[PDB]
């Protein structure tokens, strides 16, 4: 039926493969079977019958019992849908288990693929934890200061300069260019849409990043300044704060006046926000008072 | 159901066989409100009481429903865009609406 080009069977194979599934305790055949599961639905592309079968496809699986070697080239042929027909988080916990990949197969392939994909979901990693944690989790490894990149994770790694994204249009543009590591930057290009989307999504993730970083220190870079510095328009800053006020900038000051913003200067009460900067001032004045002061009198004593 | 907010069973509703016989002029009306509510418009739903005025001007009692509904949906907009704003602009803020200052002042001063 495949090559009949009748894909109307596709429900019946994938409705009697529930059936098939369960019932019985198969640990060969059913890794076989659910093959089937994704098998037509590319020619079929129903998002809800994704949300029918990664849902029971990967409900009790880890690792054991189940080879065919080519296991995790099925791996990779599980979640690559799930980034089609999901966005950007899918990868996440997806691109960070085929670290094994190389463990299992020859490595010089996986440059290009595996430690090409292996920074891709640290960078849509969510903002809150996954990044923070995460990011050790590729850390050290002697084959990631191998790759060019290296340096593009830690420039996405803290504390980030606010930096020209031209610097990084020759990097991407060479990373699409060289054959001798990360070919797939082409795949990454690879839908006449999707990479654009994972293009401005990317450029888009860098340029609020940054942001919450600098909106960490209350420095004042009074963004009418930084709409300059940045080369953009304030009219897209304004977009920019759409994706803020949904990311969160909920305590912030703005202006009807100015432009300029403040991410500080609460009402500040006294007995509660100066009464805690008191506080420890006070008393980390008086403790670290305290000890080296007693300490030196001890240094002293070694002097008669 | 369209007052407890779920215009996908006014999708399903319009969708069965069944009652879509009974589809005419008034149900119109109701996807029009319907899609403006899963829209999330306003001015839009201001078009839905706009063109079909003429089948809700034989609305019932439950136009202050609808009213509510529509002012309900406002009240969403008014704590969307002036919640990051301690200070702005009306027609900078209005501007996203589209619509006057004068009932938008009304209703937030109320």
Same mark, same amino acid.
């Given at each position: ?59 009790? %699986? ?90 593009? +994770?830690?420039?996405? %790694? ?17 990373? +699409? ?13 690879? /839908? ?44 897209? /800053? ?12 909920? %305590? ?10 403040? %991410? ?41 | ?12 509703? @319009?969708?069965?066989?069944? $009652? ?27 078009? $839905? ?54 009932? @938008? ?6």
């Amino acid at each position: 039926k495949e090559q009949n080009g009748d894909v109307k069977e596709a429900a019946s194979i994938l409705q009697e493969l529930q059936v098939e599934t369960y019932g019985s305790m198969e640990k060969k055949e059913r890794v076989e079977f659910i093959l089937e599961q994704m098998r037509l639905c590319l020619a079929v592309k129903d998002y809800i019958r994704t949300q029918i079968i990664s849902k029971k496809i990967n409900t009790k %699986f880890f690792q054991e019992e189940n080879t065919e070697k080519l296991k995790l080239k099925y791996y990779n042929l599980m979640i690559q849908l799930d980034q089609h027909e999901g966005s950007y988080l899918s990868i996440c916990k997806h691109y960070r288990a085929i670290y094994d990949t190389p463990c299992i197969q020859a490595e010089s392939e996986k440059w290009q693929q595996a430690l090409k994909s292996v920074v891709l979901y640290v960078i849509l990693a969510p903002f809150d934890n996954e990044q923070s944690d995460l990011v050790h989790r590729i850390s050290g490894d002697k084959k990631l200061e191998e790759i060019p990149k290296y340096k593009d +994770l830690l420039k996405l %790694f803290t504390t980030m300069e606010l930096m020209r994204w031209s610097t990084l249009v020759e990097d991407y543009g060479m990373e +699409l260019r060289k054959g001798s590591l990360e070919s797939p930057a082409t795949d990454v290009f690879g /839908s006449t849409e999707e990479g654009e989307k994972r293009w401005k999504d990317l450029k888009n993730r860098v340029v609020e990043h940054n942001i919450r970083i600098m909106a960490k220190y209350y420095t004042r870079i009074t963004m009418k300044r930084m709409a300059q510095l940045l080369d953009l328009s304030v009219d897209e /800053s304004e977009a920019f704060l759409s994706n803020l006020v949904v990311n969160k900038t909920i %305590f912030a000051k703005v202006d009807r006046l100015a432009g300029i913003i403040n %991410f500080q200067r609460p009402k500040d009460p006294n007995n509660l926000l100066n009464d805690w900067s008191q506080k420890l001032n006070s008393l980390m004045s008086l403790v670290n008072k305290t000890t080296h002061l007693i300490a030196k009198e001890e240094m002293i004593h070694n002097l008669q | 159901k369209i007052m407890l907010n779920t215009p996908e069973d006014v999708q399903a509703l @319009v969708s069965g066989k069944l $009652a879509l016989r009974y589809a005419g002029r008034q149900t119109e009306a109701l996807k029009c409100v319907a899609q403006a509510s899963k829209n999330r418009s306003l001015a839009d739903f201001e078009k $839905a009481l706009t063109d079909y005025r003429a089948e809700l001007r034989d609305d019932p009692i439950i136009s202050t429903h609808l009213a509510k509904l529509y002012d309900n949906l406002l009240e969403q907009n008014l704590i969307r865009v002036i919640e990051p704003f301690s200070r702005v602009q009306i027609e900078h803020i209005s501007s996203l609406i589209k619509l006057s200052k004068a009932d @938008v002042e009304r209703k937030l001063s109320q």
